[PDB]
Design a protein around this nucleic acid. Structure first.
Lengths: 68, 68, 68, 68, 68, 68, 68, 68
DNA sequence: GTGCCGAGGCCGCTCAATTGGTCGTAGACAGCTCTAGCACCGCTTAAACGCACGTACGCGCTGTCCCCCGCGTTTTAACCGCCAAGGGGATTACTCCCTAGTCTCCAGGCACGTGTCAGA
DNA sequence: TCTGACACGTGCCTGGAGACTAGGGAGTAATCCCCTTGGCGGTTAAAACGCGGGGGACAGCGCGTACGTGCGTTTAAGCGGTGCTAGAGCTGTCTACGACCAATTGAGCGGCCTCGGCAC
């Protein structure tokens, strides 16, 4: 519920940033920080989609929500 | 390289934010925006870890890099 | 509290940047903008130092906080 | 020219941000980082003042240059 | 809304930079990167024009906003 | 050669940024500033594509070139 | 330390340039110039490698960065 | 080769710049690049010194030859 | 308010990667002992702040004319489709040639004793 | 011409740069076959320029803000030195990540329907 993404994908991201070693707690904390920040953008994008008069969230509503 | 996470996971997050329908272009854009922002936090967490004299990125380095 | 630096020092900076004349209201606004931006870098450098396990803010912590 | 502000004023700023102890090399580095960022805002505020048709830098200008 | 310029125009620019072949995905990403950077210069040029006391954005307002 | 894009499209961009009136000399200067900054990104994306050993410029080459 | 090469080798280079005497100040300035020009090439060498797919920055990567 | 930096110290420079693996050919080319730029600076630095009516090469001379 | 077609929802398979277990051993934390370098208090001088007078610049008022907005016709191109091919990609073998542990050596690096060598 | 501050050369103590000899990670040619770009042709759409009306931007004089100079008072910042707190370096214990391996969860990809999104 706190980490929505797969741990192996969040770990690959921290290793491509240059991390020589990555603690499983750091993978769990990065998963939580990506999930929380993603839920915030998606919640605001859903309100932009409905203000625009549509049920579907589309690329422009994610792009505009991220620029807030 | 552009979208690090699995699309069905990023889609589940947008549907739990309340979306009634989700365009595949919104799933791809959210995957890119999460990847870019996650790489920014991870790259700075790695410089904090190496400054604390450690090779391992740990929970505290991710927490501190996100509050920047 | 709003302008931490001496006004004659902030005025000397705006005059060395090329200003032919400097209004007292521009010296006070620059003093506030330097105080606010300096407090933001120092507050994160103190958290960068306490994470490293030290009480003393050193050149490396200010350098790392300014690159955030 | 390297550090424009008074060292005891830059140190008081780092101590009000919460630092328990401050290294003299951190006071000099903060003085350099404030001087460099202050010269960037003053140099662009002087070009805004001159574009507006005036010799005097005024509060308005420093406000517009800082938001760049 | 994401790509303001004509695709055949963005593509001619990439082919004049020396590209032997250009992916349609690269034309649409270049169009988005030019549109976002152009909107940022124009938004700040509009604030420079209004600070100068005018409604009309002129050559000097675009030139000053780009040097920021 | 100095302005690659259509003037009516560069003008639409400055009007969508909030401009109440836009001078023809500002449309031409914005067209030149977008063309020059666009040629710089495209020249570096062509070199990234050729280092990677491919004649085709692709989305990842434009994305990596713009982040420089 | 600002020098990547050993001070004695920066001094030996100044002597090969015809200087009958080289000040300790000239040795430190030479070390800094070689450090700056070195890092500015190494960064581009790392980019050439990562772009070609290879993890090893080979001889081509150095020659290509020195002209880039 | 005929380099000024020590071979394993030109190598340490490339690795310290971020190299994951360094080809022993690039160690040699880096040493050549540092040697060539070194001589090209020393010759001009020696001329500027002899012009100023001094014999001991000083920081000022190298600082000016590098800024040219 | 009405018609049409984008393009997402829903479904079923399977294979590809994720999560879980257990082993090895690299690394991170705690503890001792010493040195680095900071906080405190003190002196005295630098230079900051605040007048008071002067006068340069700025902000208005307003009246010319610059030059942009609206409206419009023309035709120059950008978008699209269909058809052809070249290219880039994934899957493979073989052979580079760097990482690695182990090693000897050249010459890097700091101190001691002298005259250099830059100035009014 | 007239001339006195403080850095430099040569030796000793010391180490990290140079160099294997070998293992095997990853670099880079082969090839086969989908992806997807180039290419040619048609056509409407939307970009350019042209005229007319008039909104607002640029210049000129007046008046009055308010910044510059010069000066005095004094409150700070700076530099020394004391003296003691905390950070660094070495070392040892032990914790927890990298690694290989299993196996089954669940993500991706068509293929078929029809809800709602886009223009008139």
């Amino acid at each position: 519920m706190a980490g929505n993404f797969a741990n192996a994908r969040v770990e690959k991201l921290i290793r491509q940033a240059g991390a020589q070693r990555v603690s499983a707690d750091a993978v769990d904390k990065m998963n939580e920080i990506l999930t929380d920040w993603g839920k915030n953008i998606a919640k605001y994008a859903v309100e932009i989609a409905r203000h625009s008069g549509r049920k579907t969230v589309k690329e422009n509503d994610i792009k505009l929500a991220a620029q807030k």
